[PDB]
Design a protein around this ligand. Structure first.
Ligand SMILES: NC(=O)c1cc([N+](=O)[O-])ccc1NCc1ccc(S(N)(=O)=O)cc1
Length: 294
């Protein structure tokens, strides 16, 4: 629209295409997301509108929600790179542990803030974690999932990544809790450390079984209530749990301890963002400057 100036097509997300754009009057450079199909549910507009007040240094700011011409555009603060691209760029050498720790700590502060305001992300992945030259990392798209359900293909035939999905979602639990975000962040923490996705499933059952093959097939002992979950099948193969020392080497025991608490099967036992911030792993946390080529 005439209020902007499409610089580039940042890409295509699970909701629609995103453009980098400049406000013609303010000169502000922003990310503009064109949301995907009828008359835009009023329920969704109120929900989304509430997110304009969810402001925190580690949350990508939602600047405006435009519902005009019966269309919905979300205007977000712009950051130049995402964690998926940074991890790929850092693949040869790996992201230094101090920076992995800083990013994890900042992401947990972001989740702690959102969760205390009863807002869930539900679809965290490296691509929606944005970084800047100052060493900051921010969570993008918080709250969009609620009042927008779970999609299999973005807006036009594009495979939804299941790699970071918590087991309770995969087993059909309808009532997601803040624990799903801690699970996703744990998967991302492991990926930053090993430089390979932890559970790269290519189907819902492949995702579940990859989790079971690593963490053991869950049972009533470790996860009370699991055998009564909607999609649980007594026929699931029974795999033994592997040791974390083989899962994310050469991460130290502080890191393995924290990761193990972020990947507990029982969402009720899984560590909260607030409690994770107090974990000994963060005793020596700092805020390094990443090497960014833009
Ligand atoms: N708020 C955002 O800034 C931003 C928003 C979305 N989004 O809504 O889907 C995606 C990436 C973003 N930044 C990271 C980003 C920006 C530009 C490139 S590009 N076009 O130079 O490759 C890549 C990644």
């Amino acid at each position: 629209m005439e209020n902007f100036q499409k610089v580039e097509k940042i890409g295509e997300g699970t909701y629609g295409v995103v453009y980098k754009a400049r406000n013609k009057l303010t000169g502000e450079v922003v990310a503009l997301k064109k949301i995907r199909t009828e008359g835009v549910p009023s329920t969704a507009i109120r929900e989304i509108s509430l997110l304009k007040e969810l402001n925190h240094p580690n949350i990508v700011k939602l600047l405006d929600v435009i519902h005009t011409e019966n269309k919905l555009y979300l205007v977000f603060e712009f950051l130049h790179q995402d964690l998926k691209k940074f991890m790929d760029a850092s693949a040869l050498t790996g992201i230094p542990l101090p920076l992995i720790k800083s990013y994890l700590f900042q992401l947990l502060q972001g989740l702690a803030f959102c969760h205390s305001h009863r807002v869930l992300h539900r679809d965290l992945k490296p691509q929606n974690l944005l970084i800047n030259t100052e060493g900051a990392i921010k969570l993008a798209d918080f709250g969009l999932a609620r009042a927008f359900g779970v999609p299999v293909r973005t807006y036009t035939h594009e495979v939804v990544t299941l790699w970071y999905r918590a087991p309770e979602i995969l087993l059909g639990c309808k009532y997601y809790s803040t624990a799903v975000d801690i699970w996703s962040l744990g998967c991302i923490f492991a990926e930053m450390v090993t430089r390979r996705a932890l559970f790269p499933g290519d189907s819902e059952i492949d995702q579940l079984f990859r989790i079971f093959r690593t963490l053991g097939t869950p049972d009533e002992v470790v996860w009370p209530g699991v055998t009564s979950m909607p999609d649980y099948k007594p026929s699931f193969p029974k795999w033994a749990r592997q040791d974390f020392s083989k899962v994310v080497p050469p991460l130290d025991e502080d890191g393995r301890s924290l990761l193990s608490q972020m990947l507990h099967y029982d969402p009720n036992k899984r560590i909260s963002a607030k409690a994770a911030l107090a974990h000994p792993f963060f005793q020596d946390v700092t805020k390094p400057v990443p090497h960014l080529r833009l």
